[PDB]
Swiss-Prot record, chain B:
Similarity comment: Belongs to the herpesviridae major capsid protein family.
Gene of this entry: MCP
Subunit description: Homomultimer. Makes the hexons and eleven out of twelve pentons. Interacts with triplex proteins 1/TRX1 and 2/TRX2; adjacent capsomers are linked together in groups of three by triplexes, heterotrimeric complexes composed of one molecule of TRX1 and two molecules of TRX2. Interacts with scaffold protein; this interaction allows efficient MCP transport to the host nucleus. Interacts with capsid vertex component 2/CVC2. Interacts with the small capsomere-interacting protein/SCP.
Localization, UniProt: Virion; Host nucleus
Function: Self-assembles to form an icosahedral capsid with a T=16 symmetry, about 200 nm in diameter, and consisting of 150 hexons and 12 pentons (total of 162 capsomers). Hexons form the edges and faces of the capsid and are each composed of six MCP molecules. In contrast, one penton is found at each of the 12 vertices. Eleven of the pentons are MCP pentamers, while the last vertex is occupied by the portal complex.
Protein name: Major capsid protein
Swiss-Prot record, chain C:
Annotated protein name in UniProt: Capsid vertex component 2
Family designation: Belongs to the herpesviridae CVC2 protein family.
Gene name linked to the record: CVC2
Assembly behavior: Heterodimerizes with CVC1. Interacts with major capsid protein/MCP and triplex capsid protein 1/TRX1 at the pentamer vertices. Interacts with the large tegument protein/LTP.
Annotated source species: Human cytomegalovirus (strain AD169) (HHV-5)
Function description: Capsid vertex-specific component that plays a role during viral DNA encapsidation, assuring correct genome cleavage and presumably stabilizing capsids that contain full-length viral genomes. Participates in the interaction between the capsid and the tegument through interaction with the large tegument protein/LTP.
Swiss-Prot record, chain E:
Any one GO CC term of the record: host cell
Similarity section: Belongs to the herpesviridae CVC2 protein family.
Stated role: Capsid vertex-specific component that plays a role during viral DNA encapsidation, assuring correct genome cleavage and presumably stabilizing capsids that contain full-length viral genomes. Participates in the interaction between the capsid and the tegument through interaction with the large tegument protein/LTP.
Protein name: Capsid vertex component 2
Localization of this protein: Virion; Host nucleus
Cystine residue pairs: none
Residues shown, of full length: 179 to 642 of 642
Primary residence: virion
Quaternary structure and partners: Heterodimerizes with CVC1. Interacts with major capsid protein/MCP and triplex capsid protein 1/TRX1 at the pentamer vertices. Interacts with the large tegument protein/LTP.
Keyword Transmembrane helix in annotation: no
Protein's GO biological process: symbiont entry into host cell; viral DNA genome packaging; viral penetration into host nucleus
UniProt keyword list: Capsid protein, Host nucleus, Host-virus interaction, Viral genome packaging, Viral penetration into host nucleus, Viral release from host cell, Virion, Virus entry into host cell
Keyword Amino-acid biosynthesis assigned: no
Curated annotation (Swiss-Prot), chain G:
Gene name in the database record: UL48
Oligomeric and partner information: Interacts with host CUL1 and CUL4A; these interactions inhibit the E3 ligase activity of cullins. Interacts with inner tegument protein. Interacts with capsid vertex specific component CVC2. Interacts with the major capsid protein/MCP.
Known function: Large tegument protein that plays multiple roles in the viral cycle. During viral entry, remains associated with the capsid while most of the tegument is detached and participates in the capsid transport toward the host nucleus. Plays a role in the routing of the capsid at the nuclear pore complex and subsequent uncoating. Within the host nucleus, acts as a deneddylase and promotes the degradation of nuclear CRLs (cullin-RING ubiquitin ligases) and thereby stabilizes nuclear CRL substrates, while cytoplasmic CRLs remain unaffected.
Recorded superkingdom: Viruses
Family note: Belongs to the herpesviridae large tegument protein family.
Disulfides per UniProt: none
Full protein name: Large tegument protein deneddylase
Compartments reported by the entry: Virion tegument; Host cytoplasm; Host nucleus
Organism: Human cytomegalovirus (strain AD169) (HHV-5)
Amino acid sequence: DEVARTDEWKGAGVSRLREVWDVQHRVRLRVLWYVNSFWRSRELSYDDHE
Amino acid sequence: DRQPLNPANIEARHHGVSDVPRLGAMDADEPLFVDDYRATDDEWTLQKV
Amino acid sequence: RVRKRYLRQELRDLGHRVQTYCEDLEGRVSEAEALLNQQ
Amino acid sequence: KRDEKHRHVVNVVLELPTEISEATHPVLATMLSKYTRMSSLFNDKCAFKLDLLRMVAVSRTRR
Amino acid sequence: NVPSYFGITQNDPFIRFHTDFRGEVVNTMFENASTWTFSFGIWYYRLKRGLYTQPRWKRVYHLAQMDNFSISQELLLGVVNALENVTVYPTYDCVLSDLEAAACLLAAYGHALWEGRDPPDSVATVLGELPQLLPRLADDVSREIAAWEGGNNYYAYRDSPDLRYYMPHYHPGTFDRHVLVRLFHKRGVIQHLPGYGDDVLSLWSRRLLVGKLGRDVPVFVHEQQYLRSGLTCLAGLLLLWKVTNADSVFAPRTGKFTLADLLGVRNFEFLVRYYIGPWYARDPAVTLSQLFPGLALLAVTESVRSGWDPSRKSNPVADYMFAQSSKQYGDLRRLEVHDALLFHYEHGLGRLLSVTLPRHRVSTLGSSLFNVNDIYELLYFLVLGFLPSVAVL
Amino acid sequence: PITVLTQNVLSALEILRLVRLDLRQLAQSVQDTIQHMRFLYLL
Amino acid sequence: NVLSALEILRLVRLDLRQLAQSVQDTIQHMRFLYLL
């Protein structure tokens, strides 16, 4: 029998926990990253030209 | 000054060595200079007493 | 205020990177000295 | 030339009397290199004067 | 079916060469024929004398003798690379080239004249028709110069003194007092420019670049750096057409420099046949500096002579060469010197075209700085960027 | 059939050549960051 | 000989220490001067 997405989501878990401030540094919040997110599988490109 | 001090805003004093940029900043407010010691709970209570 | 904060963070980051590179080069030089002097 | 910079920072910033000079004060000679690289704050002479005082003090301590 | 031959003048048939024509002709000249007696201009000689003293750099430049009247190939190739790199910025890829922007700018004005002719859907037709369309623009520019009131540079951009970067929109008023944009919004070519004290241009650009750029055709009016590039290109193009048509190349030769010493209809039409169409076909990224390096050199020299400073002995070409040749110069620093050289070049061209008789100005400058004597030598220098000459004095 | 002393010398020379390259890398990175900051924040 | 190489490498270590300390002091100085 097959495995549910929720089971592998739970078992894979997280590995990140980072604090991010807003541009004007008024408010701080935390970002969680899950190692099983579909975000991983995409072919993503990133650049921050000045 | 305006916002809670983050660890980046807290600076350690350097005694026994030249520290002229700190002496220049004496009148400033944003960076706080500390003595590298921390008060234990017991002496904190005694000081409050 | 915003630009000062960002520039301060960048300057501190670069000050950390220069220390890391300096320690790497120092370790390489020390290993070269150790190998050349006493194998 | 480091001579002009040293003379400036000794006679204008530190305002020291002629009786004391770089030759006569090893602590001042050691401190001159550090002070020269900090061309700003020269309008705030008190910082440099106090730093020289505390360097002399740490020089005289028994350690 | 890309041709490998080009014709500078009608004196000789289309000379054939394989690839990379600048380097090809440079090494062919410096190998097949003796160069130790050949000479560039006196300005090249004073630059050589100034650059010889540096010990590290003279090894690259191969300036063995100061008293020698000849110049090594390395310095020439470095200068030509510097003047070619002035118009193209590799850091950000240019979606639109300056030739395309200028072509759109002129085709928008001539849409009424294009209406009588069959409607074209490609730039390949406007490139052919440009030598006929542009004289009307030149006449209109002269009329507006005589009409509009207010170093007499009518083509100078009124940029803020603090900025030294070509990329942005721009500061309001930079395009102010520049006569051509006055004509363009008087004739409706540019309906409104933000910061001023679908347009026909947009439709023309879409029609002539939907194939190359796909659906996404940026609007020129908002992305106004394309206006600056195309405007500079158009000014240079009209000035070069005037120079080429001023005197025929069939005039008797007065200088010893000839194509034999190198190899051992309308005057602009020969240039249009190959330099415009085939060069676009092989690479759409060609700019003005690729076709006319000599124009860039003379404009830079004019700006240096006038004493103008964009920020307000220094050779901006030399500074740029030191920039790419040395790793000490950063990316943004090399871009700063790049934009400073661009500023110098555009100021020089604006000063040139603000003269009533640019023919005398360019002839005198070529005679005193690059050994240019007549129209044949001027055309060869404009195409190549340099003018070798046998030293007999 | 050379001795291990020459081999150690050659390996040391290779390491020092790598250090020489890394010095230029450091200079380039410092210049790039300097100009990045100057463009963005100092203005 | 190896002794000259050892002395030169010791000088290299000293100069690396000096450069790192100087750069940290300089950035700290400008941070306290202008960035406040």
